[PDB]
Write a protein that binds this ligand. Structure first.
Ligand code: NI
Ligand code: NI
Lengths: 162, 165
């Protein structure tokens, strides 16, 4: 027996869909820069454009893996030093991320999740999902400043009109 | 009488507002260490200065909430709020009204956009993302000023419920 998608889950998913679409637009935007430009350290967040994108991807997937209760296994930025490799990494985890989100879509939103990198700490599914959502929008906001510093128009962050 | 039951959707969206309001208030506190020069200085990215970024965040949020409420307002002019204290007071004034609108439980027309109507849900998503986006811009400027930005972490933060304001 199947149930209709609950409103809470649809509202949370709209943020994910928004984030993923915006991210893809930043990947396209990054194509106009050299790998040196993409890797150049600047002030703010995790300091370079390419590592910011990697970091977003990394953190999102690490929390989704914690929700699944799988072993940590942290991908290393050293193995993803180009726009194409970071874009491929984003694609590699997407289907797993979607399946996990769908699998944890019920009304038991205070489901407890153990944090492999914090001994004796638990967060709820609800907390983690809010955190993941805010995390990407936050780092993407940082990219928009560096975009104007490079004298380039940023990708729009508007939720409406998508 | 009738049995109640918690609105999971509603509480889910409110945790973003709670997070945003707490983060914003910490940025208002962060701004006290800056000079009026540093606060108003034009920088690259977004709406270009720290004080105007905070003003823009509160203006956009209140305008949409007012659209949801069905009420229209005369544009608040940044020229009338050129100090940190004035922008903080405006933030608190708008918040009082916003809490009432969120605590009350159709399609929303906007005075600016003719021929389009939005769901309340669409608007809440837009408001939430809009603040987090601009706040992200402030963290870059913070590091450019050789200052530590305010935390953006959702996790590990005690959220004050909307009803506790
Ligand atoms: Ni981060
Ligand atoms: Ni804006």
């Amino acid at each position: 027996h199947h149930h209709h998608e609950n409103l809470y889950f649809q509202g949370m998913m709209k943020f994910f869909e928004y984030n993923w679409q915006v991210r893809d637009q930043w990947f396209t935007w990054c194509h106009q820069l050299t790998t040196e430009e993409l890797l150049k350290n600047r002030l703010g967040g995790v300091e370079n454009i390419l590592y910011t994108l990697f970091h977003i991807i990394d953190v999102e997937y690490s929390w989704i893996r914690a929700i699944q209760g799988k072993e940590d296994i942290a991908v290393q930025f050293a193995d993803y030093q180009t726009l194409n490799k970071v874009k491929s990494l984003s694609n590699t985890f997407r289907t797993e991320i979607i399946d996990v989100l769908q699998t944890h879509s019920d009304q038991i939103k205070d489901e407890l999740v153990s944090v492999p990198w914090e001994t004796g700490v638990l967060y709820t599914r609800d907390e983690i999902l809010h955190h993941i959502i805010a995390h990407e929008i936050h780092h993407i906001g940082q990219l928009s400043v560096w975009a104007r510093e490079l004298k380039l128009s940023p990708v729009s962050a508007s939720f409406i009109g998508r």
